[PDB]
């Protein structure tokens, strides 16, 4: 098999900036290289074939260059939408084989996240258990610390948490921590709270409701 | 248009996986048909191809494994996989291949088909709101959601209010407990002037149980 080393794997730029990313195959493929672009959650999309001949409806802001063994995607003036997994392919012979992706993620400025408690719902409860959800919305980078406290007692190993992919538009990103507790553990305690650590917050953000009330 | 259709589905190990690729907008006699797939947080891998003449190439390593057919009246390819085990379990795409054998552009791809190899049995979400409260209220905007919780296999689509609320929706990515069911949050933020008079309703479908859940979210 045709091996395709792609490079960086993951990479970091501003909005305007030019980015490159480099792929080699490890034998002759002539311009049988094809670059893609994927969206997470999505179909990849045919961005460059031929090694240089750009899809049409593809933005002027995409080139590829190269022939023979060493290709190279160029982006210049990046757009906060161009966040995406890319993908190089070979095509000169079977079986075909992609490097290994080259993820590209957005920079822009710091933004703390408006922070969200949900208590569990009555209809949770009476199937006897019981989800308490922390939001975290719109900031960066991704990087935060939520901890959960019931009755000011630090919590472990009983919360998971989720994050979105870049918004396409403004570049954040959204968090969800769930704190899953017994019905009866809920019910025993009263004051839950979620307290949140972020580069945009100053001091901790602490999200808290008694249980009834 | 030019579309290549493939659902989700439930394979148990060591049976086999028969997908679907339904074309239309060009002739599957003028044009190759490929099969590419993707582990979740892995790279793309390429499976098999049939060509416009009815030529067909497999990946080596798989190849005692897959077989393709074609039906042109019915502008389908089918891509049968045998003894599947759970590390078969990723998206699956056919696409595509505009051009001829030698030189072709992989332009047009179907929206891919997660297949979950696990002998876990199928299990429908259970769907509780996060009402907006004081508590999820920052200023003028006030914060709700769905919470889809128990579910197997993925995935599950989520919208609101049928399409229409769109803008400051998030889904997150569903997460898989130690249970070996899948949970995921679905949350949106609005005026909290709104909250009195607007219906909030999330719409969740979970294909493979064939399970539709609408659930609105009244306010606190």
């Known amino acids: 098999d045709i091996q395709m080393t792609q490079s960086p794997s993951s990479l970091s730029a501003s909005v305007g900036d030019r980015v490159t990313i480099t792929c080699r195959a490890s034998?002759?493929?002539?311009?049988?290289l094809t670059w893609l672009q994927q969206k997470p959650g999505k179909a990849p999309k045919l961005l460059i074939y031929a090694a240089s001949t750009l899809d049409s409806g593809v933005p002027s802001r995409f080139s590829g260059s190269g022939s023979g063994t060493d290709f190279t995607l160029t982006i210049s003036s990046l757009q906060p939408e161009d966040f995406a997994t890319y993908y190089c392919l070979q095509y000169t012979n079977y079986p075909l084989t992609f490097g290994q992706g080259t993820k590209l993620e957005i920079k822009r400025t710091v933004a703390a996240p408006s922070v969200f408690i949900f208590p569990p719902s009555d209809e949770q409860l009476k199937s006897g258990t019981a989800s308490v959800v922390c939001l975290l919305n719109n900031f960066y980078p991704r990087e935060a610390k939520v901890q959960w406290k019931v009755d000011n007692a630090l919590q472990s190993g009983n919360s998971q948490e989720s994050v979105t992919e870049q918004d396409s538009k403004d570049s954040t990103y959204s968090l969800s921590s769930t704190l899953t507790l017994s019905k009866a553990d809920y019910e025993k305690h009263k004051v839950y709270a979620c307290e949140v650590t972020h580069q945009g917050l100053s001091s901790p953000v602490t999200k808290s409701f008694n249980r009834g009330e | 248009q030019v579309t290549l259709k493939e659902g989700p589905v439930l394979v148990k190990p060591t049976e086999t996986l028969t997908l679907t690729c339904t074309v239309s907008?060009?002739?599957?006699?003028?044009?190759?048909v490929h099969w590419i797939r993707q582990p979740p947080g892995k790279a793309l891998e390429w499976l098999a191809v049939?060509?416009?003449?009815?030529?067909?190439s497999y990946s080596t390593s798989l190849m005692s494994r897959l077989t393709i057919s074609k039906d042109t009246s019915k502008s389908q390819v089918v891509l049968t996989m045998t003894n599947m085990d759970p590390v078969d379990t990723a998206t699956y795409y056919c696409?595509?291949?505009?051009?001829?054998?030698?030189?072709?552009?992989?332009?047009?791809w179907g929206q891919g088909t997660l297949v979950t190899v696990s002998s876990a049995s199928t299990k429908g979400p259970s769907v509780f709101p996060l009402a907006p409260s004081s508590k999820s209220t920052s200023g003028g905007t006030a914060a709700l959601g769905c919470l889809v919780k128990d579910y197997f296999p993925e995935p599950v689509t989520v919208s609101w209010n049928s399409g229409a609320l769109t803008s400051g929706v998030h889904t997150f990515p569903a997460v898989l407990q130690s249970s070996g069911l899948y949970s995921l949050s679905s949350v949106v933020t609005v005026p909290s002037s709104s909250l009195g008079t607007q219906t909030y309703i999330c719409n969740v479908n979970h294909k493979p149980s064939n399970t539709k859940v609408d659930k609105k979210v009244e306010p606190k």
């Open positions: 696409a595509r291949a505009y051009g001829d054998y030698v030189h072709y552009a992989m332009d047009y």
């Open positions: 034998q002759e493929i002539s311009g049988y």
């Open positions: 907008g060009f002739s599957l006699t003028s044009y190759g």
């Open positions: 049939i060509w416009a003449g009815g030529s067909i």
